[PDB]
Amino acid sequence: AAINSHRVLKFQNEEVSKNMEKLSSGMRINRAGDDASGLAVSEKMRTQVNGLR
Amino acid sequence: EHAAKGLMNAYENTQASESRIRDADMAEETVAFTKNQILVQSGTAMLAQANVR
């Protein structure tokens, strides 16, 4: 059978993909899937930043 | 995506299972052919001599 790595190879293609998702936006969190709570809080912070301005 | 990794591991292992359950090592089965072919050939020639008896 193909060795385990055809698991890894898809995963590493995915880890490369995930790295790009984060990097292009400049963020650790691009989606809730990176951090569900970091996201919800930053969305609140955004209303605070804009409302405050 | 985590679920997919789980499924992919089971997939590789299941395919390895099919191979090990059904697929023979061609090298050794080929050895069997050679032994059996020789015995066929030995049969053929000696029956020609058996006819002489």
mmCIF file of all heavy atoms in Angstrom, unseen atoms left out:
data_model
loop_
_atom_site.group_PDB
_atom_site.id
_atom_site.type_symbol
_atom_site.label_atom_id
_atom_site.label_comp_id
_atom_site.label_asym_id
_atom_site.label_seq_id
_atom_site.Cartn_x
_atom_site.Cartn_y
_atom_site.Cartn_z
ATOM 1 N N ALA A 1 0.845 -1.179 0.000
ATOM 2 C CA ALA A 1 0.000 0.000 0.000
ATOM 3 C C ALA A 1 0.881 1.229 0.000
ATOM 4 O O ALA A 1 2.052 1.164 0.391
ATOM 5 N N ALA A 2 0.384 2.358 -0.488
ATOM 6 C CA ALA A 2 1.211 3.542 -0.323
ATOM 7 C C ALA A 2 1.455 3.671 1.159
ATOM 8 O O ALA A 2 0.578 3.387 1.970
ATOM 9 N N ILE A 3 2.625 4.133 1.494
ATOM 10 C CA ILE A 3 3.040 4.345 2.859
ATOM 11 C C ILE A 3 2.155 5.404 3.477
ATOM 12 O O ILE A 3 1.425 6.091 2.751
ATOM 13 N N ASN A 4 2.258 5.611 4.795
ATOM 14 C CA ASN A 4 1.454 6.607 5.524
ATOM 15 C C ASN A 4 1.512 8.005 4.924
ATOM 16 O O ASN A 4 0.580 8.785 5.093
ATOM 17 N N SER A 5 2.575 8.332 4.200
ATOM 18 C CA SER A 5 2.920 9.708 3.950
ATOM 19 C C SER A 5 1.905 10.342 2.993
ATOM 20 O O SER A 5 1.688 11.545 3.053
ATOM 21 N N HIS A 6 1.271 9.562 2.097
ATOM 22 C CA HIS A 6 0.181 10.121 1.282
ATOM 23 C C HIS A 6 -0.957 10.647 2.154
ATOM 24 O O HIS A 6 -1.839 11.377 1.691
ATOM 25 N N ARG A 7 -0.899 10.343 3.450
ATOM 26 C CA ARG A 7 -1.656 11.063 4.449
ATOM 27 C C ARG A 7 -0.985 12.385 4.625
ATOM 28 O O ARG A 7 -1.616 13.432 4.528
ATOM 29 N N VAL A 8 0.332 12.332 4.819
ATOM 30 C CA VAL A 8 1.077 13.500 5.241
ATOM 31 C C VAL A 8 1.123 14.476 4.107
ATOM 32 O O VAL A 8 0.873 15.650 4.303
ATOM 33 N N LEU A 9 1.392 13.975 2.914
ATOM 34 C CA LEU A 9 1.567 14.797 1.750
ATOM 35 C C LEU A 9 0.332 15.657 1.551
ATOM 36 O O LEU A 9 0.450 16.872 1.413
ATOM 37 N N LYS A 10 -0.867 15.069 1.594
ATOM 38 C CA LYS A 10 -2.052 15.914 1.569
ATOM 39 C C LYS A 10 -2.078 16.886 2.763
ATOM 40 O O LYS A 10 -2.417 18.064 2.598
ATOM 41 N N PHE A 11 -1.693 16.411 3.957
ATOM 42 C CA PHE A 11 -1.701 17.269 5.136
ATOM 43 C C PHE A 11 -0.713 18.415 4.999
ATOM 44 O O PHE A 11 -1.018 19.544 5.372
ATOM 45 N N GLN A 12 0.462 18.146 4.441
ATOM 46 C CA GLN A 12 1.467 19.181 4.303
ATOM 47 C C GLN A 12 1.044 20.150 3.218
ATOM 48 O O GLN A 12 1.269 21.350 3.337
ATOM 49 N N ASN A 13 0.358 19.664 2.178
ATOM 50 C CA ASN A 13 -0.221 20.586 1.210
ATOM 51 C C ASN A 13 -1.255 21.452 1.914
ATOM 52 O O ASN A 13 -1.366 22.658 1.638
ATOM 53 N N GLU A 14 -2.007 20.841 2.842
ATOM 54 C CA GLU A 14 -2.966 21.597 3.620
ATOM 55 C C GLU A 14 -2.264 22.528 4.596
ATOM 56 O O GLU A 14 -2.683 23.674 4.736
ATOM 57 N N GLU A 15 -1.183 22.091 5.247
ATOM 58 C CA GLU A 15 -0.521 23.003 6.174
ATOM 59 C C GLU A 15 0.070 24.189 5.413
ATOM 60 O O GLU A 15 0.006 25.325 5.881
ATOM 61 N N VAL A 16 0.580 23.956 4.202
ATOM 62 C CA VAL A 16 1.032 25.060 3.372
ATOM 63 C C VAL A 16 -0.154 25.957 3.051
ATOM 64 O O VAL A 16 -0.059 27.182 3.172
ATOM 65 N N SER A 17 -1.286 25.355 2.671
ATOM 66 C CA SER A 17 -2.466 26.131 2.340
ATOM 67 C C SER A 17 -2.910 26.987 3.531
ATOM 68 O O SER A 17 -3.180 28.179 3.360
ATOM 69 N N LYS A 18 -2.939 26.398 4.741
ATOM 70 C CA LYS A 18 -3.397 27.109 5.936
ATOM 71 C C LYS A 18 -2.438 28.225 6.275
ATOM 72 O O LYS A 18 -2.836 29.314 6.698
ATOM 73 N N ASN A 19 -1.150 27.961 6.090
ATOM 74 C CA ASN A 19 -0.177 28.984 6.343
ATOM 75 C C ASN A 19 -0.487 30.169 5.448
ATOM 76 O O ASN A 19 -0.489 31.290 5.932
ATOM 77 N N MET A 20 -0.863 29.938 4.178
ATOM 78 C CA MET A 20 -1.109 31.066 3.271
ATOM 79 C C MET A 20 -2.355 31.845 3.688
ATOM 80 O O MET A 20 -2.376 33.086 3.647
ATOM 81 N N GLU A 21 -3.384 31.124 4.146
ATOM 82 C CA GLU A 21 -4.630 31.757 4.557
ATOM 83 C C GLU A 21 -4.393 32.792 5.639
ATOM 84 O O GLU A 21 -4.959 33.901 5.595
ATOM 85 N N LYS A 22 -3.529 32.436 6.584
ATOM 86 C CA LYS A 22 -3.177 33.297 7.695
ATOM 87 C C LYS A 22 -2.321 34.485 7.259
ATOM 88 O O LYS A 22 -2.604 35.640 7.596
ATOM 89 N N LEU A 23 -1.293 34.192 6.471
ATOM 90 C CA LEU A 23 -0.252 35.130 6.088
ATOM 91 C C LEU A 23 -0.803 36.261 5.225
ATOM 92 O O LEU A 23 -0.478 37.427 5.445
ATOM 93 N N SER A 24 -1.688 35.947 4.272
ATOM 94 C CA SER A 24 -2.193 36.984 3.374
ATOM 95 C C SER A 24 -3.037 38.038 4.085
ATOM 96 O O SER A 24 -3.019 39.210 3.706
ATOM 97 N N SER A 25 -3.751 37.633 5.132
ATOM 98 C CA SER A 25 -4.577 38.548 5.910
ATOM 99 C C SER A 25 -3.768 39.198 7.036
ATOM 100 O O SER A 25 -4.221 40.161 7.662
ATOM 101 N N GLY A 26 -2.558 38.678 7.264
ATOM 102 C CA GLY A 26 -1.680 39.086 8.347
ATOM 103 C C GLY A 26 -2.032 38.455 9.687
ATOM 104 O O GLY A 26 -1.508 38.872 10.722
ATOM 105 N N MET A 27 -2.921 37.454 9.687
ATOM 106 C CA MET A 27 -3.484 37.021 10.957
ATOM 107 C C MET A 27 -3.356 35.560 11.333
ATOM 108 O O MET A 27 -3.565 34.656 10.529
ATOM 109 N N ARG A 28 -3.115 35.353 12.628
ATOM 110 C CA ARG A 28 -3.184 34.049 13.277
ATOM 111 C C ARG A 28 -4.566 33.509 13.080
ATOM 112 O O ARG A 28 -4.773 32.304 12.944
ATOM 113 N N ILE A 29 -5.527 34.422 13.129
ATOM 114 C CA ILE A 29 -6.909 34.033 12.937
ATOM 115 C C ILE A 29 -7.470 34.612 11.654
ATOM 116 O O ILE A 29 -7.660 35.833 11.542
ATOM 117 N N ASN A 30 -7.784 33.731 10.700
ATOM 118 C CA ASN A 30 -8.422 34.179 9.476
ATOM 119 C C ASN A 30 -9.860 33.736 9.632
ATOM 120 O O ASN A 30 -10.796 34.438 9.243
ATOM 121 N N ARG A 31 -10.009 32.565 10.260
ATOM 122 C CA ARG A 31 -11.315 31.966 10.507
ATOM 123 C C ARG A 31 -11.480 31.517 11.973
ATOM 124 O O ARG A 31 -10.499 31.314 12.701
ATOM 125 N N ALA A 32 -12.725 31.282 12.391
ATOM 126 C CA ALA A 32 -13.012 30.722 13.717
ATOM 127 C C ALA A 32 -12.298 29.397 13.905
ATOM 128 O O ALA A 32 -11.947 29.025 15.018
ATOM 129 N N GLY A 33 -12.070 28.681 12.806
ATOM 130 C CA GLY A 33 -11.340 27.417 12.826
ATOM 131 C C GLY A 33 -9.885 27.593 13.293
ATOM 132 O O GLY A 33 -9.255 26.645 13.760
ATOM 133 N N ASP A 34 -9.344 28.813 13.237
ATOM 134 C CA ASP A 34 -8.008 28.997 13.772
ATOM 135 C C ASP A 34 -8.157 29.293 15.259
ATOM 136 O O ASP A 34 -7.418 28.766 16.100
ATOM 137 N N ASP A 35 -9.165 30.105 15.573
ATOM 138 C CA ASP A 35 -9.511 30.438 16.951
ATOM 139 C C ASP A 35 -10.863 31.106 17.039
ATOM 140 O O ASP A 35 -10.994 32.327 16.915
ATOM 141 N N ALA A 36 -11.845 30.301 17.385
ATOM 142 C CA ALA A 36 -13.228 30.702 17.459
ATOM 143 C C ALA A 36 -13.443 31.892 18.394
ATOM 144 O O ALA A 36 -14.315 32.738 18.142
ATOM 145 N N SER A 37 -12.671 31.966 19.486
ATOM 146 C CA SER A 37 -12.939 33.008 20.462
ATOM 147 C C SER A 37 -12.155 34.254 20.144
ATOM 148 O O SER A 37 -12.628 35.372 20.351
ATOM 149 N N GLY A 38 -10.986 34.079 19.556
ATOM 150 C CA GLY A 38 -10.157 35.213 19.182
ATOM 151 C C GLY A 38 -10.929 36.014 18.162
ATOM 152 O O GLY A 38 -10.938 37.246 18.187
ATOM 153 N N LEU A 39 -11.621 35.298 17.282
ATOM 154 C CA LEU A 39 -12.414 35.921 16.257
ATOM 155 C C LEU A 39 -13.556 36.707 16.854
ATOM 156 O O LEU A 39 -13.651 37.916 16.626
ATOM 157 N N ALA A 40 -14.379 36.052 17.684
ATOM 158 C CA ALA A 40 -15.544 36.713 18.254
ATOM 159 C C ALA A 40 -15.132 37.960 19.026
ATOM 160 O O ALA A 40 -15.784 39.011 18.933
ATOM 161 N N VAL A 41 -14.023 37.876 19.749
ATOM 162 C CA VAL A 41 -13.573 39.033 20.487
ATOM 163 C C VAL A 41 -13.116 40.128 19.539
ATOM 164 O O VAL A 41 -13.512 41.277 19.717
ATOM 165 N N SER A 42 -12.311 39.798 18.510
ATOM 166 C CA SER A 42 -11.856 40.855 17.618
ATOM 167 C C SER A 42 -13.028 41.502 16.888
ATOM 168 O O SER A 42 -12.996 42.697 16.607
ATOM 169 N N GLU A 43 -14.097 40.749 16.626
ATOM 170 C CA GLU A 43 -15.249 41.367 15.982
ATOM 171 C C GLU A 43 -15.867 42.390 16.928
ATOM 172 O O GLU A 43 -16.241 43.492 16.505
ATOM 173 N N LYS A 44 -15.899 42.068 18.224
ATOM 174 C CA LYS A 44 -16.388 43.035 19.192
ATOM 175 C C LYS A 44 -15.449 44.220 19.249
ATOM 176 O O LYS A 44 -15.898 45.370 19.310
ATOM 177 N N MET A 45 -14.135 43.949 19.185
ATOM 178 C CA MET A 45 -13.176 45.032 19.281
ATOM 179 C C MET A 45 -13.338 45.966 18.110
ATOM 180 O O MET A 45 -13.224 47.173 18.275
ATOM 181 N N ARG A 46 -13.649 45.424 16.936
ATOM 182 C CA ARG A 46 -13.867 46.242 15.764
ATOM 183 C C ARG A 46 -15.052 47.171 15.952
ATOM 184 O O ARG A 46 -14.983 48.344 15.571
ATOM 185 N N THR A 47 -16.130 46.699 16.603
ATOM 186 C CA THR A 47 -17.235 47.629 16.810
ATOM 187 C C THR A 47 -16.819 48.697 17.802
ATOM 188 O O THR A 47 -17.236 49.853 17.687
ATOM 189 N N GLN A 48 -15.947 48.339 18.745
ATOM 190 C CA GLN A 48 -15.475 49.302 19.720
ATOM 191 C C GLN A 48 -14.553 50.323 19.044
ATOM 192 O O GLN A 48 -14.678 51.512 19.293
ATOM 193 N N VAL A 49 -13.686 49.888 18.116
ATOM 194 C CA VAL A 49 -12.759 50.810 17.447
ATOM 195 C C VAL A 49 -13.497 51.812 16.584
ATOM 196 O O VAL A 49 -13.211 53.017 16.617
ATOM 197 N N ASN A 50 -14.428 51.312 15.774
ATOM 198 C CA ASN A 50 -15.149 52.167 14.853
ATOM 199 C C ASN A 50 -16.139 53.054 15.574
ATOM 200 O O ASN A 50 -16.250 54.246 15.273
ATOM 201 N N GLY A 51 -16.841 52.495 16.561
ATOM 202 C CA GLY A 51 -17.807 53.263 17.317
ATOM 203 C C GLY A 51 -17.086 54.350 18.076
ATOM 204 O O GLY A 51 -17.521 55.493 18.096
ATOM 205 N N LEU A 52 -15.941 54.000 18.652
ATOM 206 C CA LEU A 52 -15.144 54.916 19.433
ATOM 207 C C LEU A 52 -14.653 56.058 18.575
ATOM 208 O O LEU A 52 -14.756 57.213 18.981
ATOM 209 N N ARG A 53 -14.142 55.759 17.383
ATOM 210 C CA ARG A 53 -13.725 56.824 16.487
ATOM 211 C C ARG A 53 -14.914 57.761 16.212
ATOM 212 O O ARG A 53 -14.772 58.985 16.230
ATOM 213 N N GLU B 1 -11.995 18.335 8.467
ATOM 214 C CA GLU B 1 -10.639 18.039 8.004
ATOM 215 C C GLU B 1 -9.934 17.038 8.913
ATOM 216 O O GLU B 1 -9.207 16.160 8.428
ATOM 217 N N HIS B 2 -10.171 17.128 10.223
ATOM 218 C CA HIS B 2 -9.626 16.116 11.110
ATOM 219 C C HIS B 2 -10.266 14.783 10.736
ATOM 220 O O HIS B 2 -9.564 13.786 10.509
ATOM 221 N N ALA B 3 -11.593 14.792 10.546
ATOM 222 C CA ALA B 3 -12.303 13.579 10.212
ATOM 223 C C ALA B 3 -11.734 12.944 8.968
ATOM 224 O O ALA B 3 -11.553 11.730 8.922
ATOM 225 N N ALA B 4 -11.387 13.765 7.973
ATOM 226 C CA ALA B 4 -10.804 13.231 6.761
ATOM 227 C C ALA B 4 -9.487 12.532 7.075
ATOM 228 O O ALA B 4 -9.238 11.445 6.560
ATOM 229 N N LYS B 5 -8.665 13.079 7.978
ATOM 230 C CA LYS B 5 -7.396 12.396 8.234
ATOM 231 C C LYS B 5 -7.626 10.997 8.792
ATOM 232 O O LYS B 5 -6.936 10.036 8.419
ATOM 233 N N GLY B 6 -8.617 10.882 9.671
ATOM 234 C CA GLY B 6 -8.978 9.605 10.269
ATOM 235 C C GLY B 6 -9.396 8.611 9.194
ATOM 236 O O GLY B 6 -8.946 7.457 9.179
ATOM 237 N N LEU B 7 -10.250 9.082 8.281
ATOM 238 C CA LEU B 7 -10.777 8.262 7.201
ATOM 239 C C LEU B 7 -9.634 7.827 6.277
ATOM 240 O O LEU B 7 -9.562 6.667 5.872
ATOM 241 N N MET B 8 -8.696 8.748 5.998
ATOM 242 C CA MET B 8 -7.531 8.468 5.156
ATOM 243 C C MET B 8 -6.613 7.406 5.760
ATOM 244 O O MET B 8 -6.061 6.567 5.041
ATOM 245 N N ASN B 9 -6.467 7.401 7.086
ATOM 246 C CA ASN B 9 -5.632 6.378 7.704
ATOM 247 C C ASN B 9 -6.312 5.030 7.579
ATOM 248 O O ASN B 9 -5.680 4.031 7.220
ATOM 249 N N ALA B 10 -7.612 4.996 7.851
ATOM 250 C CA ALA B 10 -8.346 3.749 7.742
ATOM 251 C C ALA B 10 -8.286 3.246 6.292
ATOM 252 O O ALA B 10 -8.134 2.045 6.047
ATOM 253 N N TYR B 11 -8.378 4.177 5.333
ATOM 254 C CA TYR B 11 -8.359 3.888 3.905
ATOM 255 C C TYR B 11 -7.072 3.199 3.503
ATOM 256 O O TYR B 11 -7.103 2.099 2.936
ATOM 257 N N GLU B 12 -5.938 3.822 3.830
ATOM 258 C CA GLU B 12 -4.650 3.217 3.516
ATOM 259 C C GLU B 12 -4.520 1.832 4.128
ATOM 260 O O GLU B 12 -4.063 0.890 3.468
ATOM 261 N N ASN B 13 -4.922 1.700 5.391
ATOM 262 C CA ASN B 13 -4.804 0.422 6.064
ATOM 263 C C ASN B 13 -5.740 -0.621 5.477
ATOM 264 O O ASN B 13 -5.379 -1.801 5.359
ATOM 265 N N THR B 14 -6.937 -0.194 5.072
ATOM 266 C CA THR B 14 -7.888 -1.126 4.507
ATOM 267 C C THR B 14 -7.341 -1.611 3.167
ATOM 268 O O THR B 14 -7.401 -2.805 2.869
ATOM 269 N N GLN B 15 -6.789 -0.695 2.355
ATOM 270 C CA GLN B 15 -6.192 -1.124 1.097
ATOM 271 C C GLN B 15 -4.991 -2.040 1.326
ATOM 272 O O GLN B 15 -4.809 -3.015 0.595
ATOM 273 N N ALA B 16 -4.172 -1.756 2.343
ATOM 274 C CA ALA B 16 -3.088 -2.673 2.683
ATOM 275 C C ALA B 16 -3.667 -4.038 3.078
ATOM 276 O O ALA B 16 -3.097 -5.085 2.749
ATOM 277 N N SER B 17 -4.825 -4.023 3.755
ATOM 278 C CA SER B 17 -5.461 -5.260 4.174
ATOM 279 C C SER B 17 -5.861 -6.062 2.934
ATOM 280 O O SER B 17 -5.589 -7.261 2.852
ATOM 281 N N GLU B 18 -6.482 -5.400 1.943
ATOM 282 C CA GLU B 18 -6.898 -6.113 0.734
ATOM 283 C C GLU B 18 -5.685 -6.729 0.043
ATOM 284 O O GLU B 18 -5.721 -7.889 -0.375
ATOM 285 N N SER B 19 -4.598 -5.950 -0.048
ATOM 286 C CA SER B 19 -3.396 -6.412 -0.727
ATOM 287 C C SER B 19 -2.865 -7.629 0.021
ATOM 288 O O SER B 19 -2.751 -8.707 -0.555
ATOM 289 N N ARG B 20 -2.675 -7.517 1.344
ATOM 290 C CA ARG B 20 -2.120 -8.649 2.090
ATOM 291 C C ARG B 20 -3.029 -9.872 2.129
ATOM 292 O O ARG B 20 -2.556 -11.008 2.164
ATOM 293 N N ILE B 21 -4.334 -9.651 2.152
ATOM 294 C CA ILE B 21 -5.279 -10.746 2.082
ATOM 295 C C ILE B 21 -5.312 -11.449 0.727
ATOM 296 O O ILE B 21 -5.380 -12.684 0.665
ATOM 297 N N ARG B 22 -5.308 -10.666 -0.365
ATOM 298 C CA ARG B 22 -5.425 -11.246 -1.700
ATOM 299 C C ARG B 22 -4.154 -11.298 -2.544
ATOM 300 O O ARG B 22 -3.987 -12.281 -3.265
ATOM 301 N N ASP B 23 -3.260 -10.294 -2.471
ATOM 302 C CA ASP B 23 -2.169 -10.166 -3.453
ATOM 303 C C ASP B 23 -0.922 -10.978 -3.088
ATOM 304 O O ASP B 23 -0.355 -10.829 -2.003
ATOM 305 N N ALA B 24 -0.539 -11.890 -3.972
ATOM 306 C CA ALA B 24 0.601 -12.770 -3.715
ATOM 307 C C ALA B 24 1.941 -12.137 -4.090
ATOM 308 O O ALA B 24 1.997 -11.188 -4.874
ATOM 309 N N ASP B 25 3.036 -12.670 -3.536
ATOM 310 C CA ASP B 25 4.367 -12.237 -3.936
ATOM 311 C C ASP B 25 4.730 -13.016 -5.182
ATOM 312 O O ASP B 25 4.985 -14.229 -5.147
ATOM 313 N N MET B 26 4.754 -12.292 -6.287
ATOM 314 C CA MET B 26 4.920 -12.842 -7.615
ATOM 315 C C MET B 26 6.225 -13.611 -7.732
ATOM 316 O O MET B 26 6.350 -14.507 -8.574
ATOM 317 N N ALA B 27 7.234 -13.231 -6.949
ATOM 318 C CA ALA B 27 8.510 -13.907 -7.076
ATOM 319 C C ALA B 27 8.389 -15.365 -6.664
ATOM 320 O O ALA B 27 8.936 -16.247 -7.329
ATOM 321 N N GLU B 28 7.651 -15.632 -5.583
ATOM 322 C CA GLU B 28 7.614 -16.986 -5.049
ATOM 323 C C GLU B 28 6.636 -17.815 -5.828
ATOM 324 O O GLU B 28 6.857 -19.009 -6.057
ATOM 325 N N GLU B 29 5.555 -17.182 -6.271
ATOM 326 C CA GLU B 29 4.607 -17.929 -7.071
ATOM 327 C C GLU B 29 5.238 -18.312 -8.403
ATOM 328 O O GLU B 29 4.966 -19.390 -8.925
ATOM 329 N N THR B 30 6.120 -17.455 -8.929
ATOM 330 C CA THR B 30 6.851 -17.753 -10.152
ATOM 331 C C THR B 30 7.754 -18.979 -9.925
ATOM 332 O O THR B 30 7.844 -19.863 -10.787
ATOM 333 N N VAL B 31 8.399 -19.056 -8.741
ATOM 334 C CA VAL B 31 9.233 -20.219 -8.422
ATOM 335 C C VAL B 31 8.401 -21.496 -8.555
ATOM 336 O O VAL B 31 8.859 -22.491 -9.133
ATOM 337 N N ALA B 32 7.164 -21.456 -8.030
ATOM 338 C CA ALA B 32 6.271 -22.611 -8.091
ATOM 339 C C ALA B 32 6.016 -23.064 -9.524
ATOM 340 O O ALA B 32 6.043 -24.263 -9.813
ATOM 341 N N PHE B 33 5.840 -22.099 -10.431
ATOM 342 C CA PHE B 33 5.659 -22.369 -11.845
ATOM 343 C C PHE B 33 6.818 -23.156 -12.383
ATOM 344 O O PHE B 33 6.625 -24.210 -12.997
ATOM 345 N N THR B 34 8.026 -22.670 -12.125
ATOM 346 C CA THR B 34 9.195 -23.335 -12.648
ATOM 347 C C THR B 34 9.274 -24.768 -12.135
ATOM 348 O O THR B 34 9.518 -25.692 -12.911
ATOM 349 N N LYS B 35 9.055 -24.984 -10.833
ATOM 350 C CA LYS B 35 9.076 -26.352 -10.329
ATOM 351 C C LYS B 35 8.031 -27.208 -11.057
ATOM 352 O O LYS B 35 8.334 -28.314 -11.514
ATOM 353 N N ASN B 36 6.810 -26.669 -11.202
ATOM 354 C CA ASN B 36 5.721 -27.471 -11.741
ATOM 355 C C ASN B 36 5.917 -27.729 -13.244
ATOM 356 O O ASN B 36 5.622 -28.822 -13.728
ATOM 357 N N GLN B 37 6.475 -26.750 -13.968
ATOM 358 C CA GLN B 37 6.725 -26.887 -15.404
ATOM 359 C C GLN B 37 7.747 -28.000 -15.667
ATOM 360 O O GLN B 37 7.601 -28.802 -16.597
ATOM 361 N N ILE B 38 8.774 -28.062 -14.826
ATOM 362 C CA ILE B 38 9.796 -29.094 -14.920
ATOM 363 C C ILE B 38 9.177 -30.459 -14.719
ATOM 364 O O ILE B 38 9.467 -31.403 -15.464
ATOM 365 N N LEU B 39 8.309 -30.569 -13.714
ATOM 366 C CA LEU B 39 7.635 -31.828 -13.462
ATOM 367 C C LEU B 39 6.721 -32.207 -14.641
ATOM 368 O O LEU B 39 6.650 -33.384 -15.007
ATOM 369 N N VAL B 40 6.075 -31.227 -15.293
ATOM 370 C CA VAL B 40 5.301 -31.538 -16.501
ATOM 371 C C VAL B 40 6.212 -32.089 -17.584
ATOM 372 O O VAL B 40 5.931 -33.132 -18.195
ATOM 373 N N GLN B 41 7.333 -31.406 -17.801
ATOM 374 C CA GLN B 41 8.242 -31.803 -18.858
ATOM 375 C C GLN B 41 8.846 -33.187 -18.615
ATOM 376 O O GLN B 41 8.996 -33.976 -19.554
ATOM 377 N N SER B 42 9.152 -33.487 -17.349
ATOM 378 C CA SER B 42 9.711 -34.771 -16.953
ATOM 379 C C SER B 42 8.692 -35.873 -17.257
ATOM 380 O O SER B 42 9.038 -36.932 -17.790
ATOM 381 N N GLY B 43 7.420 -35.593 -16.955
ATOM 382 C CA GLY B 43 6.304 -36.490 -17.217
ATOM 383 C C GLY B 43 6.233 -36.824 -18.691
ATOM 384 O O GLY B 43 6.212 -37.999 -19.081
ATOM 385 N N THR B 44 6.236 -35.782 -19.518
ATOM 386 C CA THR B 44 6.039 -35.952 -20.943
ATOM 387 C C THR B 44 7.118 -36.882 -21.513
ATOM 388 O O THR B 44 6.794 -37.909 -22.117
ATOM 389 N N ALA B 45 8.395 -36.542 -21.284
ATOM 390 C CA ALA B 45 9.498 -37.331 -21.828
ATOM 391 C C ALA B 45 9.504 -38.764 -21.290
ATOM 392 O O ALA B 45 9.737 -39.714 -22.049
ATOM 393 N N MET B 46 9.216 -38.957 -20.008
ATOM 394 C CA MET B 46 9.362 -40.299 -19.474
ATOM 395 C C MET B 46 8.207 -41.183 -19.895
ATOM 396 O O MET B 46 8.388 -42.390 -20.059
ATOM 397 N N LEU B 47 7.030 -40.607 -20.139
ATOM 398 C CA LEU B 47 5.955 -41.450 -20.636
ATOM 399 C C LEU B 47 6.310 -41.954 -22.027
ATOM 400 O O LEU B 47 6.019 -43.099 -22.369
ATOM 401 N N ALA B 48 7.033 -41.146 -22.812
ATOM 402 C CA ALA B 48 7.483 -41.606 -24.124
ATOM 403 C C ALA B 48 8.347 -42.861 -23.947
ATOM 404 O O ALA B 48 8.290 -43.787 -24.754
ATOM 405 N N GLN B 49 9.153 -42.892 -22.871
ATOM 406 C CA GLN B 49 10.001 -44.049 -22.593
ATOM 407 C C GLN B 49 9.182 -45.192 -21.968
ATOM 408 O O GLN B 49 9.423 -46.374 -22.250
ATOM 409 N N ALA B 50 8.170 -44.833 -21.179
ATOM 410 C CA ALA B 50 7.262 -45.804 -20.580
ATOM 411 C C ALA B 50 6.558 -46.608 -21.663
ATOM 412 O O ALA B 50 6.270 -47.795 -21.499
ATOM 413 N N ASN B 51 6.292 -45.961 -22.789
ATOM 414 C CA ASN B 51 5.695 -46.606 -23.942
ATOM 415 C C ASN B 51 6.595 -47.716 -24.469
ATOM 416 O O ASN B 51 6.124 -48.651 -25.107
ATOM 417 N N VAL B 52 7.902 -47.608 -24.230
ATOM 418 C CA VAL B 52 8.827 -48.588 -24.742
ATOM 419 C C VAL B 52 8.767 -49.860 -23.952
ATOM 420 O O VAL B 52 8.725 -50.925 -24.550
ATOM 421 N N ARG B 53 8.787 -49.754 -22.620
ATOM 422 C CA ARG B 53 8.655 -50.904 -21.702
ATOM 423 C C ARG B 53 8.390 -52.298 -22.383
ATOM 424 O O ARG B 53 9.337 -53.086 -22.511
#
